[PDB]
Design a protein around this motif. Structure first.
Motif, PDB file in Angstrom:
ATOM      1  N   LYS A   1       0.743  -1.202  -0.463  1.00 45.72           N
ATOM      2  CA  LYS A   1       0.217  -0.259  -0.215  1.00 45.72           C
ATOM      3  C   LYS A   1       0.681   1.524  -0.330  1.00 45.72           C
ATOM      4  O   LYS A   1       0.766   2.081  -0.819  1.00 45.72           O
ATOM      5  N   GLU A   2       1.581   1.531   0.578  1.00 45.70           N
ATOM      6  CA  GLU A   2       2.740   2.665   1.272  1.00 45.70           C
ATOM      7  C   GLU A   2       3.610   2.699  -1.007  1.00 45.70           C
ATOM      8  O   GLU A   2       3.614   4.193  -0.951  1.00 45.70           O
ATOM      9  N   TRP A   3       4.189   1.700  -0.906  1.00 49.12           N
ATOM     10  CA  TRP A   3       4.888   1.702  -2.025  1.00 49.12           C
ATOM     11  C   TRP A   3       3.635   2.441  -3.457  1.00 49.12           C
ATOM     12  O   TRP A   3       4.404   2.749  -4.351  1.00 49.12           O
ATOM     13  N   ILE A   4       2.683   2.071  -3.582  1.00 47.99           N
ATOM     14  CA  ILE A   4       1.424   2.553  -4.456  1.00 47.99           C
ATOM     15  C   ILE A   4       1.306   3.658  -3.947  1.00 47.99           C
ATOM     16  O   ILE A   4       1.378   4.581  -4.930  1.00 47.99           O
ATOM     17  N   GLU A   5       0.987   4.175  -3.192  1.00 41.70           N
ATOM     18  CA  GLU A   5       0.453   5.652  -2.494  1.00 41.70           C
ATOM     19  C   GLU A   5       1.936   6.302  -3.229  1.00 41.70           C
ATOM     20  O   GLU A   5       1.464   7.848  -3.769  1.00 41.70           O
ATOM     21  N   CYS A   6       2.680   5.600  -3.262  1.00 37.20           N
ATOM     22  CA  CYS A   6       4.282   6.435  -3.087  1.00 37.20           C
ATOM     23  C   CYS A   6       3.965   7.273  -4.749  1.00 37.20           C
ATOM     24  O   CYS A   6       4.713   7.988  -5.692  1.00 37.20           O
ATOM     25  N   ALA A   7       4.484   5.813  -5.602  1.00 39.57           N
ATOM     26  CA  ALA A   7       4.408   5.630  -7.003  1.00 39.57           C
ATOM     27  C   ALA A   7       2.624   5.684  -7.832  1.00 39.57           C
ATOM     28  O   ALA A   7       2.187   4.624  -8.596  1.00 39.57           O
ATOM     29  N   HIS A   8       2.801   6.630  -7.829  1.00 37.53           N
ATOM     30  CA  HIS A   8       1.176   6.659  -7.938  1.00 37.53           C
ATOM     31  C   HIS A   8       1.106   8.397  -8.282  1.00 37.53           C
ATOM     32  O   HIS A   8       0.637   9.404  -8.125  1.00 37.53           O
ATOM     33  N   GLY A   9       0.857   8.602 -10.024  1.00 37.31           N
ATOM     34  CA  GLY A   9       0.615   9.443 -10.990  1.00 37.31           C
ATOM     35  C   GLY A   9       2.438   9.838 -10.683  1.00 37.31           C
ATOM     36  O   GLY A   9       1.898  11.101 -11.669  1.00 37.31           O
ATOM     37  N   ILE A  10       2.687   9.642 -10.954  1.00 38.44           N
ATOM     38  CA  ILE A  10       4.166  10.284 -10.703  1.00 38.44           C
ATOM     39  C   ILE A  10       5.306   9.688 -12.200  1.00 38.44           C
ATOM     40  O   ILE A  10       6.128  10.092 -12.555  1.00 38.44           O
ATOM     41  N   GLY A  11       4.664   8.755 -12.838  1.00 36.00           N
ATOM     42  CA  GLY A  11       5.474   8.093 -13.602  1.00 36.00           C
ATOM     43  C   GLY A  11       6.038   6.873 -12.692  1.00 36.00           C
ATOM     44  O   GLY A  11       6.771   7.124 -12.336  1.00 36.00           O
ATOM     45  N   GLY A  12       6.429   6.264 -13.964  1.00 41.65           N
ATOM     46  CA  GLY A  12       7.343   4.671 -13.940  1.00 41.65           C
ATOM     47  C   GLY A  12       8.905   5.134 -13.778  1.00 41.65           C
ATOM     48  O   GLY A  12       9.492   4.880 -12.507  1.00 41.65           O
ATOM     49  N   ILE A  13       9.054   6.683 -14.566  1.00 41.56           N
ATOM     50  CA  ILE A  13      10.667   6.586 -14.569  1.00 41.56           C
ATOM     51  C   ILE A  13      10.630   7.313 -13.057  1.00 41.56           C
ATOM     52  O   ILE A  13      12.577   6.779 -12.999  1.00 41.56           O
ATOM     53  N   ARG A  14       9.924   8.009 -12.806  1.00 40.69           N
ATOM     54  CA  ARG A  14       9.862   8.968 -11.178  1.00 40.69           C
ATOM     55  C   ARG A  14      10.123   8.005 -10.057  1.00 40.69           C
ATOM     56  O   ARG A  14      10.897   7.646  -9.833  1.00 40.69           O
ATOM     57  N   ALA A  15       9.330   6.848 -10.028  1.00 35.19           N
ATOM     58  CA  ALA A  15       8.551   5.608  -9.088  1.00 35.19           C
ATOM     59  C   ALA A  15       9.936   5.149  -9.326  1.00 35.19           C
ATOM     60  O   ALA A  15       9.972   4.981  -8.078  1.00 35.19           O
ATOM     61  N   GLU A  16      10.579   4.654 -10.215  1.00 32.61           N
ATOM     62  CA  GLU A  16      12.212   3.584  -9.933  1.00 32.61           C
ATOM     63  C   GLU A  16      12.521   4.174  -9.023  1.00 32.61           C
ATOM     64  O   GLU A  16      13.475   3.832  -8.822  1.00 32.61           O
TER      65      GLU A  16
END
Lengths: 139, 347, 100, 105, 121, 171, 175, 98
Positions: D37-52
């Motif tokens: 849940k934390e990882w998804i909430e962090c990586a939501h709408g910021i794009g895969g490249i930023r999320a990586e």
């Protein structure tokens, strides 16, 4: 990739024995790969026949690599120009001559000298100018 | 095979590909591939010959291995990430295994050996379905996972596919085998731009699909599977062989024909990414494809091969069945180059 | 460990009997006594497989009956059963059920 | 060519099983529900490249919860050193770890 | 890739409502005329394949070909213009949002700059 | 990274409810009816905090309340309850059905001496309110700051500066 | 020894895989597959998957390979090929066991073996969770949700099985 | 990763190698296919049970549903090959070349 790193780490025109050894190893690896593919696609009649074919291909390739590295590094030392692609061209033509000798054919030798030397000089030019055979997607 | 059953099997193939191109869950994508195989196998054997059975067996074995490797890759990615979604793949080993599986499904070399044999075994219509529709699903999967794809492996497979497709075709006098090797080369061309720009892959796929549809429909209309049987066509239907020559020139990529635009745009995108040696080698290697296209054209239309006395009988009759989309496919395959800037629609 | 014990005991007992019945009576002194068509009806076996698959898909039903979306559960269960019946009917009508 | 027909038509064909932190029967939690849940909430709408890279901490914690490679490595080190000390004879496991005291209910 | 993941993109929509802000393709666009020409060629080829009179038979069929090609080409051109306009809008917005990445450069007259001469001797 | 803050042994030492499962199940309904408030408070603490360490005191209160409940049972209804749980203990599944008569005896005695009323079916399973003075955990997950979203939807669309700008095309 | 029942079972699983992978006559191959299926059921049961593992025992052992055997019987070969029958089969069988032994020994001796992935030699009991599932079998509820949640999976699987019946009929037509 | 994962991945690798190296019979290769499917089932089941992915406990079942479909297809082809050649031998699938 470790073999390629070994060949690259040795400075060009220095430690000719080590450069020749690394080129010999690279040739041996390529010869083994070609031998495996040949054994698979074209089956050998016997296990001894397979070993003979593998040894023939691997020794041909290892001799090509050893002569290329040996001649190239020697030429770089003697000419004292390390970055000149002509050293790589001489190495490539020498490797092609060895290919002709192992194939016992003059025409194979001459064609291999020409094409392989041109490719080797191209590889040296790519090293110098930063040419990328495979480019990371940067768009 | 009962026509209702044939329609159900074809719809099942198309539904499998639609599930592949529609699902966001890896299990369902693999399920779509499984449905594609299950429905495809009997379609390849609509006409029962020993060659048809052999082709079906080879295709099943190859696609089954590809599916098993794909499922293992999915399972590994699940193990290391816990995600089922088709997205960036978080394990490099899983990425490599998935790439090998999808390449094997696409017939990319060195997993190409089954394409010529299967194409020769099956009929012209089954060959059309195999070489046009079946390519859609794996290419879609690769496009969705393009970012995770290691560019080196994909590029090596693409270059090998181009080389082998060019080489194999030179030696072939069977039309179906020629088409299979051409398909291999064009698949290499499409997968070359996959790491860089997927829209170019889609554009190349569309152009290739139109050209192969046109070529296979012309072959079906001429009922020729060998070079000589096609050579006999000039005496009967000269228009067919003339259009075949034009489509072959397009497939070779000659300007100003439509076959030029996918190569042109692919070279453009690769150069923008500083790839210069690779596009140069690919373009030069396309000359082998061009050569055997030209040899086929010489055999078919440009030169008049001897006919047989019994052809006078076929002169009196006319072709019963009409393939409606063939003219439009020819026009798109040959005269769409002035309309490239419309490549922003699929974008 | 209980199930493993049971398996071990049963297997050992049966194998012990096989020993006392293959070797123990083989000692008794005696003398010298000297001493396929392609089944296309195997289609029945293959159909069993695809029906055994539906068998597996149907086993969760007793726990499936415990959901709150009993409407959806019932619709999907009857959907699977009707698809199985349709498969049987298709094979029946197309003379595919040519047993022996 | 991922035609997101599910998002267009608002149909949840397969997204229910996409993640472990999605709704599950009788609200049975996953073993790594919090981290996911934390990882998804962090990586939501910021794009895969930023999320990586901007959510790499969350992803590392999620991976550790899933596989426990580092936890097993730590425990293996502990067991190794305990065996080493026992061989040297400078350690004696406590009676409760030897079973000489009743564990708490 | 690229525009596929643009925020706010409704999936499986040929022309978003934003596109209506852009000018419609003129019905006399050379591209649309070329599409009609392609349709006419398709009609001619259909007649030739079916061994009909090439330029006279099936005037209704040729008309349907031309109408279909033009009709689809109109929306094709509209979407093409929409996508190019979207690209330009995104590019300009990014340039504004990242001034450092796109710095204004000092302009100099050629008299100020020094470019070496290579004589053609 | 950081050191885990495990609580000391002394703080986690509590009086224990040393009664077997059958004994607890026999008194389960009246235990839930009487000791609901501390139990519901502890449950709310555990589910909001999501840390076992944070709610040790609430667990202590739950244990104390259970001990008081059982002390009252021992004081007033010892023998009927003993018979009830000995009956329950026999059945492998510890079923309530087989011990209805002993259940009636225990319920009657507990209603007389202590006034407890057995909760009816579908009562103990109801979601209940709890009034607590403990503040709501602000960040129970201890989540880091969420990364900032990308800028979006700058404004209106205008035609391309010179069309496609693709090679030689002017439109 | 009971501490590594899962590991012992996994080794037996690998051995059965080497057995049917060396390709003796499909009879012995079937035996290896049957043993491997039972052993996989054992591992799954140890990890808490009673239903799933039992499924292999019935729909895999008594299912897919029950017909595999029925098939080999129809296409009877002249001689029952065994591991020793062909030197290669026996050699590969031994090498496969040796390969397993090498990785097994390396994993135990080197706390952290890395063949293609990284594996820790600690017993599998370590990874297990300390939570409680209450009055439920999590595997059972997840599998039964196939009718309540996985309606789409039910549709696709049923359609695939029907098309599989049709496909098998068409393939076995033979014209 | 615990050692059981290593063992099962090794089993899949071995089965894959066996499938890719035919000897004579097609049935042995189909046995390798079914075997690889078993490895995948066991791996998926272990992952899902360990991670308590309740809603994914059905994925192993669907995998097997399609495993048996694939097996059935393989046998349906093998019978036809045997009918056309008299054996299941791989060397008879030689008419199509290159």
């Amino acid at each position: 990739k470790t073999l390629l790193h070994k060949y690259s780490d040795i400075p060009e025109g220095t430690e000719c024995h080590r450069k020749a050894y690394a080129s010999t190893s690279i040739g041996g690896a390529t010869g083994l790969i070609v031998s495996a593919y040949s054994i698979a696609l074209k089956p050998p009649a016997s296990f001894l026949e397979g070993v003979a074919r593998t040894g023939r291909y691997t020794f041909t390739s290892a001799a090509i690599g050893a002569i290329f590295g040996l001649t190239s590094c020697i030429s770089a030392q003697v000419r004292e120009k390390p970055d000149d692609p002509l050293n790589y061209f001489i190495g490539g033509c020498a490797g092609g001559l060895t290919l002709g000798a192992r194939t016992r054919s003059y025409g194979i030798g001459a064609a291999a000298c020409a094409y392989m030397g041109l490719t080797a000089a191209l590889v040296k030019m790519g090293q110098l100018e930063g040419w990328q055979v495979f480019a990371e997607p940067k768009v | 095979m009962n026509p209702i059953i044939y329609t159900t099997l074809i719809m099942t193939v198309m539904s499998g590909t639609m599930l592949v191109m529609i699902s966001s869950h890896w299990l369902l994508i693999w399920i779509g591939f499984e449905m594609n195989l299950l429905a495809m196998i009997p379609v390849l054997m609509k006409n029962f010959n020993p060659r048809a059975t052999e082709a079906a067996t080879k295709y099943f074995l190859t696609q089954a291995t590809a599916s098993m490797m794909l499922m293992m890759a999915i399972i590994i990615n699940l193990l290391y990430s816990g995600q089922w979604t088709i997205t960036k793949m978080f394990n490099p080993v899983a990425m490599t295994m998935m790439t090998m599986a999808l390449a094997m499904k696409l017939g990319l070399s060195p997993f190409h050996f089954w394409v010529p044999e299967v194409t020769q075994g099956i009929s012209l219509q089954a060959g059309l379905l195999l070489l046009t529709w079946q390519k859609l699903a794996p290419l879609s999967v690769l496009c969705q996972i393009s970012q995770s794809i290691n560019p080196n492996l994909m590029l090596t497979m693409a270059m090998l596919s181009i080389l082998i497709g060019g080489w194999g075709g030179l030696n072939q006098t069977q039309l179906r085998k020629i088409m299979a090797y051409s398909s291999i080369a064009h698949m290499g061309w499409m997968t070359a731009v996959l790491p860089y720009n997927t829209t170019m892959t889609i554009l190349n796929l569309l152009i290739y699909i139109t050209m192969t549809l046109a070529m296979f429909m012309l072959l079906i209309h001429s009922s020729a599977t060998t070079t000589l049987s096609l050579s006999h066509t000039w005496n009967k239907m000269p228009v067919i062989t003339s259009l075949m020559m034009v489509t072959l020139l397009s497939m070779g990529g000659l300007p100003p024909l439509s076959g030029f635009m996918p190569k042109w745009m692919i070279i453009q995108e690769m150069t923008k990414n500083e790839s210069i040696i690779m596009p140069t080698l690919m373009a030069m290697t396309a000359l082998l494809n061009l050569y055997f296209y030209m040899r086929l054209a010489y055999s078919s239309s440009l030169t008049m091969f001897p006919s047989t006395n019994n052809m006078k009988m076929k002169w009196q009759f006319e072709h019963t069945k009409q393939m409606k989309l063939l003219p439009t496919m020819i026009v798109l395959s040959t005269l769409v180059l002035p309309m490239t800037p419309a490549l922003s629609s699929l974008n | 460990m209980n199930i493993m014990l049971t398996l071990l005991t049963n297997v050992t007992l049966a194998s012990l009997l096989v020993l006392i019945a293959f070797w123990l009576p083989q000692l008794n002194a005696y003398s010298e006594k000297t001493s396929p068509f392609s089944m296309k009806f195997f289609l029945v076996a293959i159909t069993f497989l695809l029906f055994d698959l539906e068998i597996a898909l149907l086993l969760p039903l007793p726990w499936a009956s415990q959901t709150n979306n009993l409407k959806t559960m019932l619709t999907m269960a009857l959907f699977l059963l009707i698809l199985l019946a349709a498969s049987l009917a298709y094979e029946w009508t197309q003379k595919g059920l040519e047993w022996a | 060519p991922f035609f997101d027909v599910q998002k267009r038509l608002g149909l949840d064909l397969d997204r229910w099983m996409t993640i472990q932190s999605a709704e599950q029967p009788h609200k049975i939690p996953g073993r790594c529900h919090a981290f996911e849940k934390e990882w998804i909430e962090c990586a939501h709408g910021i794009g895969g490249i930023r999320a990586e890279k901007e959510c790499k901490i969350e992803f590392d914690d999620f991976v550790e919860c899933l596989l426990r490679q580092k936890t097993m490595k730590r425990l293996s080190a502990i067991k190794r050193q305990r065996d080493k000390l026992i061989k040297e004879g400078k350690y004696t496991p406590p009676p409760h770890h030897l079973g000489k005291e009743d564990p708490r209910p | 890739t690229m525009m596929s993941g643009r925020p706010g993109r409704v999936p499986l929509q040929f022309l978003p409502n934003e596109a209506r802000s852009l000018p419609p393709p003129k019905l006399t666009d050379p591209r649309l005329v070329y599409m009609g020409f392609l349709g006419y060629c398709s009609g001619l080829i259909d007649n030739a394949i079916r061994r009909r009179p090439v330029v006279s038979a099936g005037l209704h069929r040729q008309l349907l070909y031309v109408t279909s090609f033009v009709f689809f080409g109109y929306y094709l051109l509209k979407r093409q213009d929409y996508m190019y306009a979207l690209r330009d809008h995104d590019m300009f917005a990014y340039v504004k949002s990242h001034p450092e990445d796109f710095p204004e450069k000092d302009k100099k007259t050629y008299g100020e700059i020094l470019e070496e001469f290579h004589p053609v001797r | 990274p950081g050191i885990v803050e495990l609580p000391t042994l002394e703080d986690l030492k509590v009086q224990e409810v040393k009664v077997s499962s059958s004994v607890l199940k026999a008194a389960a309904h009246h235990y839930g009816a009487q000791c609901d408030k501390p139990n519901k408070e502890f449950m709310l603490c555990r589910w909001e905090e999501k840390d076992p360490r944070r709610c040790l005191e609430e667990g202590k209160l739950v244990n104390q309340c259970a001990l008081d409940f059982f002390r009252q049972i021992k004081r007033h209804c010892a023998e009927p309850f003993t018979e009830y749980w000995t009956c329950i203990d026999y059945s492998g599944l510890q079923l309530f059905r087989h011990c209805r008569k002993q259940q009636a005896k225990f319920d009657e005695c507990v209603l007389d001496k202590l006034g407890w009323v057995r909760p009816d079916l579908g009562e103990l399973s109801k979601v209940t309110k709890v009034k607590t003075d403990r503040p709501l955990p602000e960040n129970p997950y201890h989540s880091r700051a969420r990364p900032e979203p990308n800028p979006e939807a700058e404004g209106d669309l205008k035609p391309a500066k010179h069309g496609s700008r693709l090679f030689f095309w002017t439109m | 020894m009971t501490m590594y029942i899962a590991f012992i079972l996994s080794t037996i699983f690998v051995i059965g895989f080497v057995g049917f992978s060396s390709k003796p006559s499909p009879i012995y191959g079937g035996l290896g597959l049957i043993v491997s299926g039972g052993v996989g059921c054992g591992i799954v049961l140890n990890f808490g998957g009673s239903f799933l593992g039992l499924m292999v025992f019935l729909i895999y052992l008594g299912g897919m390979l029950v017909v595999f055997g029925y098939t080999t019987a129809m296409a009877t070969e002249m001689y029952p090929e065994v591991w020793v029958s062909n030197k290669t089969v026996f050699g590969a069988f031994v090498s496969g066991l040796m390969m397993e032994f090498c990785m097994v020994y390396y994993a135990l001796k080197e706390e952290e073996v890395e063949i293609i992935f990284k594996f820790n030699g600690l017993g599998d009991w370590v990874i297990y969770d300390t939570g409680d599932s209450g009055f439920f079998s999590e595997e059972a509820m997840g599998i039964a949700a196939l009718y309540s949640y996985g309606t789409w999976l039910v549709i696709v699987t049923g359609w695939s099985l029907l098309i599989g019946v049709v496909v098998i009929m068409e393939i076995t037509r033979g014209n | 990763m615990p050692l059981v994962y290593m063992n099962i991945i090794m089993a899949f690798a071995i089965a894959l190698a066996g499938l890719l190296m035919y000897r004579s019979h097609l049935m042995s290769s189909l046995l390798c296919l079914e075997g690889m499917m078993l490895s995948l089932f066991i791996m998926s089941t272990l992952i899902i049970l360990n991670t308590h992915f309740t809603l994914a406990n059905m994925m192993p079942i669907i995998l097997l549903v399609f495993a048996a479909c694939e097996a059935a297809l393989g046998l349906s082809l093998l019978v036809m090959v045997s009918n056309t050649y008299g054996t299941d031998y791989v060397q008879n699938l030689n008419l199509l070349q290159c």
